[PDB]
């Protein structure tokens, strides 16, 4: 009923970690799947679009609480944990209630002592620092991203990527293919997560599609509602 | 009575972060002093050759709980740490949770992760920082010390650690004196810190300590120690029991 959501392409565009206040949540791979149970924290890895089947225990509050890590703190944090420590079940990492989480978050000085902390206290590290370390890369689709990022409302084609990237259009094509994305999903995987984020945001549905680029605010619901499954308002309800 | 003691030259070879458990010391400087209290942390410098002045509480309990950084460690922490007067070398503070710290004191890939969290929940951070940064400097005294180390039975002369160098001996004397020390002094210090390592081991003797840190007669060792130290090492054995 209204305790249980669906939605497609979910994509985790900086490396989050994840509780578990007010859910039981299932996270859906191409081939695998990762149940995250409640009272839990889960290590989401960025670059990852996902399938996410969640069951709200109370139906008033929102069913989690996530913190994010910008590229910035996120090679600080891969910087520190190289300098200390020297699949789907490789990316998505759920652990122990803390039971000592005390929550910072405006002090990435003193949040990012705490990440490392949390971690050296963590069983089964070296997966937690892979993850870290991976999304720590710019990978080409991450580039070709930054590129765009500053011009949503412009439509780009290949070939503007391709002579900003000093390259040739198939060379881009073979690239985004070998990093399983291509230059059109790219840009609505961009618009559609500014979408997301501006509804849980202080935008509206009015000027949410103009700010990602849309003119239309109903072919705007229309692509919402088949990128993620869920109509704005299911998004906007379930996370109020 | 045994609850107090007064050793002089002490000195941190290594980083030490130091509870008070069971003292209340006061730590003397050539010009400067500071009273730790009792049950407090405090941070010390690596290089910081100082006098104390403890009370035990309990006559029966060592009167301190101290951790020590490699210089390894040191370096590592002072990296991590970047990444993320006697007043700016020695720093005491309060803590409430040290229950977190217990942790298990036998790796780097965790306890120095648990030392940032402590610096980063401690209030004036900047002056702890400062001392890691300054304290994980390789000054030319802690090279001729390095030189030195490896052999402690050596007799080492100015003109041997010079060579070793490939410089002059007053350029040597000039460098140490600006480092406020000597290479007899280096060499004494050096010596004595092993000694009082030796010592409290509660397993070496007098009778092969001295030869372990180069003295062959342990008289005269016995008479080095209660010089440099300014208490007999029996003295200094039993306060640390």
Redesign the interface.
Known sequence: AKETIKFNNFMIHKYTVLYTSNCIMDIYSEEEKITCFSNRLVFLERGVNISVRMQKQILSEKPYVAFRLNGDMLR?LK??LM????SMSRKIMTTEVNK?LLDNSHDN??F???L??L??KLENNEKIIESIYISSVSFFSDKVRNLIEKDLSRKWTLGIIADAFNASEITIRKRLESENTNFNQILMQLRMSKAALLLLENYQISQISNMIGISSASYFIRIFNKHYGVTPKQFFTYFK
């Open positions: 600080h910087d520190a300098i200390i420590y020297g000592t000085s003193a990012i002592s705490s490392i902390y971690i050296s």
